[PDB]
Write a protein that binds this ligand. Structure first.
Ligand SMILES: N[C@@H](Cc1c[nH]c[nH+]1)C(=O)O
Ligand SMILES: N[C@@H](Cc1c[nH]c[nH+]1)C(=O)O
Ligand SMILES: Nc1cccc2cnccc12
Ligand SMILES: Nc1cccc2cnccc12
Lengths: 415, 415
């Protein structure tokens, strides 16, 4: 009987049609990274499990696709890339010249719904100032504009965790509870306030402390945060600098302040941001932030400032489909070379060689078939031109060329 | 203390330097596939284990990186791509238009030495005739020529399993032993004749039968095979057609007949081939062949002719390094925008925007630093041009431009 034609649970196949859609997306990721001066890197999908043991109750680490090798070693299919980046960065030490701007498009994994997705990662390493976050946010807007979206379709919500850090510290809560608190508060929009309030109670935070978090999360503007913490709290000056810089780059209509944005990851220390559709129909398009302590927690002797984001391949595609910005673009090829019959095949191969030699994409009809079915084939594969190689033209040093989107042409004139 | 900076056992990191080498290779794979009219596809690295249970004692299936999920399902990190391709092909059925020419560059996995490698796969589906093998072999030569190699450096050895099939059948050996026999005979060059002879004895093949295999493997030319099986054995006409066609395409100096080539995979039915360095220093550069029965064994109601090859990312790189064809090509960027000081940053961002708007790759100096260190940075990141944004030029609607591989220029003139 049949073998199982469906892919493994939660995983996608990319036959040519779907692959073209993915490549359209990835081409933008690559093109944007190049426009912004980022350098590509990669690392193994298989990493040590201990790389992701952060103990803050993170969704990303709770849903880890992990297993034990035959030699008893605890590994996982990476749930995200940032730990791999830091590993690479630590490996280089003082040999890594800074600042560094590194990007990748890893497939990342989870176990629970989809179990895999691709995630464009962009990170700036060695830059203390908000200029890093500005560039990253502009890179994300650029990718989206490149895909056909506008500031009418999407935006980027931006906040700083430092604001909340103050409230946590000032309430007497030891800072080891800060990350788990961000993690729980990250669920605030999704699940009820009672549930989030309940989760914070379990961590030992008192009712007063919880209340102070709620209020600051609901503050609707930077001037309101300034009233609460001061116009020269670390966060106020950074955010103002950030908006001033994004404005200057011409993307002011894409970004805004939102005090409810914290992200679900333990390691963010400063500015955080996430992309969203302005119709409120989809989950976050991308998300990122500054994580200045991570390399220190991995054992770096010297603190390494870092900031970056991930930008998934799934939500963006749903948005683009909704907006009618992913028309099927069929496969194309420049030339299809058609032997008049099998006796002409050697000659048609010589023609095939010349066409490809000149940088053209070209097929030759591989089967034995009638000239008209060859033309049908040429049309199906999206050929710009059909080149018929028939005995009578060949003797004259020519072929029959026909534009598809039949005049005899000398061989040398083909290209 | 430190986290483990080394990657998981047998797996490679690709920091920007190494990633550039890989991208140089992959660009050729992609460029060649496009020149030859192949369409990209992909599938999950995680496949069902049962997809690879072929029971012929294959190295590829013996060294399978497999595990059991938490839900008891037997899966594996794919040891090769061809089973995934067939799965995809079967899923499509009559909706798949033929012939089809599909390619991918999957990371493939093994457990035992390296445990991962990338493998360019190229396959032609729905083509009975040797024209498929011709195109595939030419594609492999093309990729190698594109990388800087010549027919002096490398070649492609070519054979047909049909020859050996006859000897196996004519000796009374039931055809269910044919694949395991190819598998054992594949080891002939590597391990001693005694060991290969011994492995064939264990399968129940008699001394006479073994002898007949040895002789045919050592036959040095097609005329010698013709003497043995006939000038119109299936194999003779196919091979002659194959060499005639590769000759006509202009790659005759790249290919040759070798009766010892069988490949290690169970499913090859016809022509098989493998690339090699002409100094005898390296293992096979690539390998492939026709596998007309595979889709039938997976349950296809109608036989689907297929042929293809895999071309690894490791051996080719060692060869290219030996031949001095992988010089380090440093990272480049067109422009580096340098704010004279922080007050000029908003203006420098506007300049940054314009440059990128025009399709240029551009950095802006993200840190606070002196103009000369900014220039050093520009040189380190391989900038073609440094664009200094200073207050006095700005008032005149200009910036200072300096070619690195300082004249005031109007903004509009930059691009
Ligand atoms: N790893 C984060 C994104 C990120 C990259 N760099 C910094 N943050 C995520 O998966 O959401
Ligand atoms: N899967 C084969 C190569 C191949 C692709 N298509 C046909 N053969 C290998 O790994 O060697
Ligand atoms: N959020 C996510 C993390 C890791 C892997 C994923 C796979 N599919 C969807 C979402 C994922
Ligand atoms: N031959 C091979 C098959 C599957 C995975 C591999 C990883 N590294 C080297 C060789 C491999």
């Amino acid at each position: 009987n049949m073998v199982e034609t469906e892919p493994v649970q939660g995983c996608r196949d990319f036959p040519p049609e779907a692959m073209r859609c993915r490549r359209h997306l990835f081409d933008v990721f690559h093109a944007t990274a190049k426009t912004f001066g980022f350098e590509e890197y990669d690392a193994p999908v298989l990493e040590s499990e201990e790389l992701y043991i952060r103990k803050a109750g993170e969704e990303i680490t709770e849903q880890m696709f992990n297993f034990i090798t035959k030699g008893g070693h605890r590994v996982a299919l990476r749930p995200e890339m940032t730990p791999s980046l830091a590993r690479l960065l630590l490996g280089k030490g003082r040999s890594l010249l800074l600042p560094a701007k590194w990007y990748s498009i890893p497939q990342c994994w989870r176990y629970e719904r989809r179990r895999e997705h691709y995630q464009w990662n962009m990170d700036i390493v060695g830059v203390k100032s908000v200029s890093a976050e500005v560039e990253l946010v502009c890179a994300a807007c650029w990718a989206m504009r490149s895909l056909g979206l506008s500031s009418k379709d999407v935006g980027i919500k931006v906040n700083s965790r430092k604001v909340l850090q103050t409230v946590v510290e000032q309430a007497g809560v030891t800072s080891d509870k800060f990350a788990p608190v961000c993690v729980i508060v990250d669920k605030m929009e999704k699940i009820p306030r009672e549930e989030v309030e309940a989760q914070l109670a379990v961590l030992g935070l008192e009712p007063t402390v919880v209340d102070a978090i709620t209020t600051t999360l609901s503050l609707k503007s930077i001037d309101e945060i300034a009233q609460r913490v001061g116009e020269e709290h670390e966060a106020v000056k950074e955010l103002r600098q950030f908006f001033e810089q994004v404005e200057a780059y011409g993307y002011g209509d894409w970004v805004l302040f939102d005090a409810s944005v914290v992200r679900g990851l333990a390691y963010y220390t400063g500015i955080v941001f996430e992309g969203f559709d302005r119709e409120g129909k989809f989950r976050a398009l991308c998300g990122g932030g500054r994580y200045d302590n991570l390399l220190t927690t991995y054992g770096s002797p010297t603190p390494i400032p870092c900031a970056g984001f991930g930008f998934g391949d799934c939500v963006i595609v749903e948005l683009l489909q909704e907006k009618r910005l992913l028309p099927d673009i069929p496969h194309v090829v420049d030339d299809v070379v058609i032997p008049f019959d099998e006796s002409m095949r050697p000659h048609a191969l010589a023609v095939l060689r010349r066409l490809r030699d000149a940088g053209r994409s070209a097929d030759i009809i591989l089967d034995k078939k009638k000239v008209v079915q060859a033309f049908n084939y040429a049309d199906r594969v999206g050929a710009v031109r059909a080149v018929l190689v028939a005995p009578e033209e060949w003797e004259r040093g020519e072929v029959q060329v026909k534009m598809l989107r039949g005049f005899a042409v000398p061989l040398d004139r083909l290209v």
